[PDB]
Amino acid sequence: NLTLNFGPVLRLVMELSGEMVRKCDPHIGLLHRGTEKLIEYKTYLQALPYFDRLDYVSMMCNEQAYSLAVEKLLNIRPPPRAQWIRVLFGEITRLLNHIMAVTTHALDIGAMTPFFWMFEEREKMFEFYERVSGARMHAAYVRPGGVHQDLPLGLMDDIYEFSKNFSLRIDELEEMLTNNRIWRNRTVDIGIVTAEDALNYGFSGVMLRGSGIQWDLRKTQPYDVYDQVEFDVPIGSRGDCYDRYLCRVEEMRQSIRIISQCLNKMPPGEIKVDDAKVSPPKRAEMKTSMESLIHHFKLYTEGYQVPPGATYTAIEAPKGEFGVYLVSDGSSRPYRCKIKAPGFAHLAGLDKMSKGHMLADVVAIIGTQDIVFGEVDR
Amino acid sequence: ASATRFIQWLRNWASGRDLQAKLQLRYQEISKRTQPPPKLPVGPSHKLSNNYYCTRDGRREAMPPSIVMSSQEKKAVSPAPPIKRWELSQDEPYL
Amino acid sequence: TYKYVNLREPSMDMKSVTDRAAQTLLWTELIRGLGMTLSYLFREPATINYPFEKGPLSPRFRGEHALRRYPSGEERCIACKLCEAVCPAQAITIEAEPRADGSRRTTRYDIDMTKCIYCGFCQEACPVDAIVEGPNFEFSTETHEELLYNKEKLLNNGDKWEAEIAANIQADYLYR
Amino acid sequence: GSDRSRFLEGKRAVEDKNIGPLVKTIMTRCIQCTRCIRFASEIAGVDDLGTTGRGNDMQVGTYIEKMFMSELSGNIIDICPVGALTSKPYAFTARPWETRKTESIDVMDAVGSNIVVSTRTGEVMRILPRMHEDINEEWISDKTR
Amino acid sequence: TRPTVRPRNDVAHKQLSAFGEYVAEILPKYVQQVQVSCFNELEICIHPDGVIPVLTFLRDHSNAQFKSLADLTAVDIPTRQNRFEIVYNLLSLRFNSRIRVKTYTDELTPIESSVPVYKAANWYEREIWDMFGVFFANHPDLRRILTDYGFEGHPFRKDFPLSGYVELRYDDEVKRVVAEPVELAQEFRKFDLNSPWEAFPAYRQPP
Amino acid sequence: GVRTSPTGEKVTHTGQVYDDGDYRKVRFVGRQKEVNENFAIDLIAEQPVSQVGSRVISCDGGGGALGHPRVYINLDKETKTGTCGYCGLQFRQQHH
Amino acid sequence: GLLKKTTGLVGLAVCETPHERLKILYTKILDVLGHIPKNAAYRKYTEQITNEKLSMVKAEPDVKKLEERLQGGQIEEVILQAENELSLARKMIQWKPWEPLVEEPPASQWKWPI
Amino acid sequence: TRDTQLITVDEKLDITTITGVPEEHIKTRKARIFVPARNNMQSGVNNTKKWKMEFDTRERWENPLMGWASTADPLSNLVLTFSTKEDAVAFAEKNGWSYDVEERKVPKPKSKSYGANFSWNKRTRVSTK
Amino acid sequence: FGVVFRASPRQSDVMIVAGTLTNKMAPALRKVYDQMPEPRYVVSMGSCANGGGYYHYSYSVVRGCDRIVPVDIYVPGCPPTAEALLYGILQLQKKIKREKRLRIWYRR
Amino acid sequence: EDNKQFFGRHRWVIYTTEMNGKNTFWDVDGSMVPPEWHRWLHCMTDDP
Amino acid sequence: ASTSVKPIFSRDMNEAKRRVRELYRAWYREVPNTVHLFQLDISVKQGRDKVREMFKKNAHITDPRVVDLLVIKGKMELEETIKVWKQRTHVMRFFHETEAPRPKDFLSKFYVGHDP
Ligand code: SF4
Ligand code: SF4
Ligand code: SF4
Ligand code: SF4
Ligand code: SF4
Ligand SMILES: [K+]
Numbered sequence A: 001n002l003t004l005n006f007g008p009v010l011r012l013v014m015e016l017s018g019e020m021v022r023k024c025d026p027h028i029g030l031l032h033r034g035t036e037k038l039i040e041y042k043t044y045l046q047a048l049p050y051f052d053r054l055d056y057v058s059m060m061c062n063e064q065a066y067s068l069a070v071e072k073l074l075n076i077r078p079p080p081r082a083q084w085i086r087v088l089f090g091e092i093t094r095l096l097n098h099i100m101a102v103t104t105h106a107l108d109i110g111a112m113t114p115f116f117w118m119f120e121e122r123e124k125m126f127e128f129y130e131r132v133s134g135a136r137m138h139a140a141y142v143r144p145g146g147v148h149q150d151l152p153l154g155l156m157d158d159i160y161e162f163s164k165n166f167s168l169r170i171d172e173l174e175e176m177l178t179n180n181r182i183w184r185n186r187t188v189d190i191g192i193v194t195a196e197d198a199l200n201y202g203f204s205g206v207m208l209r210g211s212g213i214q215w216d217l218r219k220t221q222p223y224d225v226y227d228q229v230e231f232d233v234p235i236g237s238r239g240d241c242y243d244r245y246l247c248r249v250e251e252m253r254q255s256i257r258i259i260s261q262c263l264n265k266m267p268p269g270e271i272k273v274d275d276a277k278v279s280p281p282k283r284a285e286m287k288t289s290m291e292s293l294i295h296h297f298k299l300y301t302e303g304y305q306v307p308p309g310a311t312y313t314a315i316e317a318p319k320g321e322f323g324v325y326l327v328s329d330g331s332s333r334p335y336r337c338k339i340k341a342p343g344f345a346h347l348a349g350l351d352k353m354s355k356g357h358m359l360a361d362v363v364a365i366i367g368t369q370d371i372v373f374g375e376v377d378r
Numbered sequence B: 001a002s003a004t005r006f007i008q009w010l011r012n013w014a015s016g017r018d019l020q021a022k023l024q025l026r027y028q029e030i031s032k033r034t035q036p037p038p039k040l041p042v043g044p045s046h047k048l049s050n051n052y053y054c055t056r057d058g059r060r061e062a063m064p065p066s067i068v069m070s071s072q073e074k075k076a077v078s079p080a081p082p083i084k085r086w087e088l089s090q091d092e093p094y095l
Numbered sequence C: 001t002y003k004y005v006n007l008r009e010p011s012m013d014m015k016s017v018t019d020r021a022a023q024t025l026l027w028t029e030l031i032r033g034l035g036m037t038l039s040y041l042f043r044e045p046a047t048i049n050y051p052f053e054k055g056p057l058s059p060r061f062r063g064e065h066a067l068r069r070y071p072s073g074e075e076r077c078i079a080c081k082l083c084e085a086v087c088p089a090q091a092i093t094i095e096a097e098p099r100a101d102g103s104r105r106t107t108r109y110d111i112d113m114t115k116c117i118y119c120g121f122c123q124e125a126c127p128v129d130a131i132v133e134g135p136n137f138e139f140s141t142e143t144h145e146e147l148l149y150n151k152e153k154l155l156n157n158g159d160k161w162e163a164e165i166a167a168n169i170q171a172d173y174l175y176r
Numbered sequence D: 001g002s003d004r005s006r007f008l009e010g011k012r013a014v015e016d017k018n019i020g021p022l023v024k025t026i027m028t029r030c031i032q033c034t035r036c037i038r039f040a041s042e043i044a045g046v047d048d049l050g051t052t053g054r055g056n057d058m059q060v061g062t063y064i065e066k067m068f069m070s071e072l073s074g075n076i077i078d079i080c081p082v083g084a085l086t087s088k089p090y091a092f093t094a095r096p097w098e099t100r101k102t103e104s105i106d107v108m109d110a111v112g113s114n115i116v117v118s119t120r121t122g123e124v125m126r127i128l129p130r131m132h133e134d135i136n137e138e139w140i141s142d143k144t145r
Numbered sequence E: 001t002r003p004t005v006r007p008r009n010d011v012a013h014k015q016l017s018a019f020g021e022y023v024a025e026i027l028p029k030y031v032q033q034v035q036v037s038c039f040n041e042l043e044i045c046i047h048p049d050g051v052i053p054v055l056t057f058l059r060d061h062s063n064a065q066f067k068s069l070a071d072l073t074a075v076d077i078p079t080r081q082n083r084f085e086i087v088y089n090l091l092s093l094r095f096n097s098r099i100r101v102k103t104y105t106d107e108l109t110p111i112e113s114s115v116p117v118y119k120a121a122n123w124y125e126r127e128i129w130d131m132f133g134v135f136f137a138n139h140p141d142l143r144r145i146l147t148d149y150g151f152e153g154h155p156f157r158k159d160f161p162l163s164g165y166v167e168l169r170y171d172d173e174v175k176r177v178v179a180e181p182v183e184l185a186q187e188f189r190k191f192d193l194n195s196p197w198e199a200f201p202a203y204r205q206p207p
Numbered sequence F: 001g002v003r004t005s006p007t008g009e010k011v012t013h014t015g016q017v018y019d020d021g022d023y024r025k026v027r028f029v030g031r032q033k034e035v036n037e038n039f040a041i042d043l044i045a046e047q048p049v050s051q052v053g054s055r056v057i058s059c060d061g062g063g064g065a066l067g068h069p070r071v072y073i074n075l076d077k078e079t080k081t082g083t084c085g086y087c088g089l090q091f092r093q094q095h096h
Numbered sequence G: 001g002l003l004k005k006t007t008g009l010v011g012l013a014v015c016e017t018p019h020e021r022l023k024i025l026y027t028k029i030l031d032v033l034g035h036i037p038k039n040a041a042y043r044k045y046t047e048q049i050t051n052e053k054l055s056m057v058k059a060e061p062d063v064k065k066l067e068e069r070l071q072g073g074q075i076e077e078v079i080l081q082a083e084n085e086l087s088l089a090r091k092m093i094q095w096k097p098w099e100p101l102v103e104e105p106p107a108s109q110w111k112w113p114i
Numbered sequence H: 001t002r003d004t005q006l007i008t009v010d011e012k013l014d015i016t017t018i019t020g021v022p023e024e025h026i027k028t029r030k031a032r033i034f035v036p037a038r039n040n041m042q043s044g045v046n047n048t049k050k051w052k053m054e055f056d057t058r059e060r061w062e063n064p065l066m067g068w069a070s071t072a073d074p075l076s077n078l079v080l081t082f083s084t085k086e087d088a089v090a091f092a093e094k095n096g097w098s099y100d101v102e103e104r105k106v107p108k109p110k111s112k113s114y115g116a117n118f119s120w121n122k123r124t125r126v127s128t129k
Numbered sequence I: 001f002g003v004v005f006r007a008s009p010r011q012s013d014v015m016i017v018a019g020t021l022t023n024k025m026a027p028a029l030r031k032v033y034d035q036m037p038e039p040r041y042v043v044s045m046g047s048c049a050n051g052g053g054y055y056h057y058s059y060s061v062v063r064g065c066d067r068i069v070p071v072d073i074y075v076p077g078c079p080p081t082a083e084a085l086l087y088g089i090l091q092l093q094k095k096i097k098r099e100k101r102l103r104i105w106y107r108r
Numbered sequence J: 001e002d003n004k005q006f007f008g009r010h011r012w013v014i015y016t017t018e019m020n021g022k023n024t025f026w027d028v029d030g031s032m033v034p035p036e037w038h039r040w041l042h043c044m045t046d047d048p
Numbered sequence K: 001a002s003t004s005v006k007p008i009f010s011r012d013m014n015e016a017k018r019r020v021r022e023l024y025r026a027w028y029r030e031v032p033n034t035v036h037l038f039q040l041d042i043s044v045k046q047g048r049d050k051v052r053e054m055f056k057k058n059a060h061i062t063d064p065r066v067v068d069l070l071v072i073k074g075k076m077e078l079e080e081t082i083k084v085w086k087q088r089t090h091v092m093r094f095f096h097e098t099e100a101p102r103p104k105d106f107l108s109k110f111y112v113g114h115d116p
């Protein structure tokens, strides 16, 4: 059979018997940087910015997974207002990821116009990131204990004005794709996954929900205040690219439904745990009180010690189930930090999902899995 | 927002929707770039009495794992009760 | 709760079946897509006229590191090395010794702007508001060596951007 | 200790004493532990340190312009818990976490004191004692330091 | 309740302790230790010969149904005779629970491949091989996955240096990218951060 | 202030200058040497000594939360002044 | 008692005779368990939970009400789990996990922190 | 009583050829196994409880451009931790490194008495409190 | 500005290196650079490409793309804003405006 | 300024034709904005 | 029981040597195809001597388990060359063409630096 090393951050080694794909062999590592080994020379706070850079489309949801894991080993609890902020920006991050996933999935198969309409919406959401943290993408805003700073005055009004119009933007996206017969032909009955193969291959997220499996960690193993909001979990019927495209488009609508509740049920209070052996004190009280200066000095040089133990903590990240197997030895620096990227198992099933399909279908199947190689390789 | 009436009619008809009510460009409905100073609150631990740290020390209440078995009539059990079935949404069951 | 996305049963009456025959033969839903692109042709584009117009930012923006002074002209930094300890990229290098008048002052303060991840931890750790990230984001160079800042380059930045740096810190220090 | 302060008053401040070119004194940081007093009297044999005053105004020093020069004086830097007594030659040069520790031996005399040599980016920053019950315990002479 | 302390869930601690005993009674041949953490996670520690028996039981039994392999990784501890600790993290959609299964090995003793039980283990085991050097027997396709071709050593071992042993560069004479011993313009600076005062007396070890 | 070496190269506030025969000076040919002209040691020497009427005075650097950690300075010695360890300002007791 | 058009799970076909299929499988499981030693805990537990699921099938002629009793999702899922238990039982005979522990771990194999 | 068949290997456990370390850093290095000495500026003893293994120091020079501290030794920062001395020597032997072992130095018990401060006829009577 | 969104390697005038260059990726980068028809310029975007950034001390990262290919412009930031990369591109335009190829050939 | 324009186009700067002895009629540059105006032009404040 | 361990492939050195020789034959017959596919500038004789040198280094191993691993890595390194997963840079890294010779005698090491 003819063999092609398509290469370049993905190198695909495929053997093709004419038009059919007889085997797909993904060669990865072109973006391996040794993240997990570097985290072992950092304090728990110094390793926080690494997680913004794993799945760089869903930055603030990787912080939350790491923050949930550390807060679990510390045995502390973030304050209620911080949790509501961490859900508000978890759903805003979920709009950022699904626009990128859907529109770059459609741009790789020809439809270039929806990319430009929706990247004007991403630009506006990048201002919400920049107004709270000061950075458009790698905010490092979610931390063990809560969030770094409180929302600036007037941001929630600007989130409301944006959310008020977004549902119309999705509708225009669906006027170009959902019923277009060319789009359906590229995505219907392509990459069919059985509900039993998906579980045994390690799939999670819309890779499960597209095949009819009723599973969403936000509802079954909730974290923060996801059990105080109302939303629906889209479910597929045929387990193909088209059903999975409808699940992400419908999850963008259920995020607007969650955001509308976070804006109305946002409580008052503080935004980081009121324990100054974990979260740094205020600068005003760091410059007047002796204990607050001692604790500021030690938290930013040694860091807080985490009791010995190991934990596996996971969230429903935009691309699936994202978790970390964090191991502590009782010091300020983690011993081992394994990262479970949902796209690592999804891309390992590309060979299975591309059996009996054309070469041009492998493009669609890679798109439907929503692969970002920052997390796959780490 | 400066589109003439005719072009507004043409754009609305082409898309089938009322675009002027949900413009994707921001004009004046946005917050002022200068805002009054805030006064943020303080947490529950900002007290002058009845506030000893040994009564709210989360890290010191963590314990090492408990050993249930170690090599150095009973009714069957499962890790947890079986998960309850999900219910169709009355909001919009079918898309 | 959950909802089905693609579980509809299409009707098989003659009118419905003829509706899908007209759609197949007369390309109705394809021409519905041409109309949407036509509407965008008559919408005002979102492009701004850079470099004469700039994208909005906020007082919390994190740009070019810089070293500040007190209103008297004395340097704020007292060589505590907290920023050097917290920098996740190890982009900061410091050396200090007693000054001629006995003050605790640095003799080296370098930031490698190619190791730096522009994270802001250096300005959170500083107890005296000495090292800050300013609002300047247009400082690209033509060689790699121009991005290795030393204490002279960082003090020049502070004197150069103090008017804007002070106003930003005035606008945000109540949230810190 | 706790993690916050409920102290709402003004703080005490004390004037510094000059006791030679080796030990720098910033006595507002003293916590009146009396380790330096007990060391200078029992280990060193110089009864020049003491407590003057009473109550919250109690101070540690010489009470006169006297220099605590001895072949063992530098050791009060290590036993002082706080930054009240710090090495003057070492002042402001390095922080403890950035130093690499090399466990070596002394050669300034024939006793063979066990020392720790602190380096930092390829430069020797200071010399500290290293416990050895049979040679030097946890003391070194000023010349070795 | 205490606003700053994570609440305890004693119900889930009693249910996971019952199931841990339940598993150890059914596989005495393999289970060496079962422990439940203070934040309600269950760990089954097994002899390395029981990787296939124990995992198959947990996937297929009617009261376990751990049908999803959340993750599989290794941890390196140089002070043990068997350095490498292999960790399986599993999920159960039927009972909405998670469980952790751990075994051990060393540089030279192989472990049985889990691909027959979980097709998800195919790539995870290559990653453990590539980064730790643990050989998995009967693997359909075992080879480096993350490191560069021709890479020597296993970078996640605790004794492998952070910056490696060689670095790449373009040489104009030979018109290709070459590998050379690593010299750093600025050496990585090592900070000794640990405080000399005990932090947690609950975890103190016997002297 | 900035004073130039015999070879014409300026001296920084830390005292740095390349000797005459140091090859490293070639980096400045067709270029310049970045030197900050505002020597902090000179600027803080121009500030007047503040007269106070108490044994102990407090300094926070000015601006409240925008200054430096608040420290208390003892003014019992008339031979010298009280100097702030953070900002370098000086304080003196009024004739007692 | 109307038959369902789809199970909702891709690759899982509807079964027209759920009651007959389950009785066969459960009986087959109980017959395979007879070859396992009497005292082995796997036999005692699996018989305990197989019989009560077999008694629920033989006392509930309605499929929808049977699923509520079994609590295993679709009746096709309960059939699939029976086939997995049957395969597991056939494998426990060859493994014999009821024997004593093969080997003890080294002295400090499970100590943490080191 | 394992089911798998076992073989006999009566040889020294040596892995120098499969760890991938260049021979330059196996034969010319000298590991040092020791218990870190207590930092003399503090009274804490919590950093003197585990055995460490470090390698021998090598050249550090100055970067011509900035003045940073350059190095060519890939083992300059490598530190390993061990629960006991026997486990540290085991790791060095199988990796082929030459090592020196220094016995743990534990402070000897001391005889303390607050009443000795006020002795009637002995030399331990202090003169100040 | 005239800067097309996407161009093939053989129809392109500038290479923008945006991300971390690993040791497994470096040979592919040099190959693409050698096949670019001249004149050709390289823009280094971000801390990773400039000097390695957050992964500088990693075993699998090339410390700066400028030791694999020549670089004309360095754009700092992690990541640089989209308005900071645009400023760098317009700074490459002015650099090309200062070229004097013909005025140096005429004086040979 | 022109507040009828949509946010982002409501403030612009027409650069000088000469700055620090450099001819900037054609060679404009975004770093020619001094810090005091750099804050107003980027909408970090409403006060010129 | 301490010396009783599980094997990888070979139960004794005699079976291990069989795998070593089969691997050597595989490498010996591939050099002409490698020197041709990658358009190397070395000769086939130089290629076949490098294989000989690599095998010679590990000729003092007496542990069958260790020998099995060396063969496993050799077969992995071989599959990369046959299938052209490597590139010309990777193949030529066995030769060190851009590294200046480093002296082996005491005096030369004394003149240049401090390393032994
Ligand atoms: S922004 Fe972050 S990475 Fe950059 S110098 Fe400051 S602390 Fe270091
Ligand atoms: S934290 Fe601030 S005062 Fe301390 S060394 Fe850094 S810049 Fe100077
Ligand atoms: S040893 Fe230090 S803290 Fe103790 S009394 Fe002497 S100066 Fe004060
Ligand atoms: S380091 Fe210690 S002695 Fe120095 S000021 Fe802080 S608490 Fe006081
Ligand atoms: S955003 Fe930062 S971490 Fe990510 S590739 Fe760019 S420079 Fe590297
Ligand atoms: K001291």
Ligand SMILES: [Zn+2]
Residues within 6 Å of the ligand: F059, F060, F061, F068, F084, F085, F086, F087, F088, F089
């Ligand atoms: Zn001051």
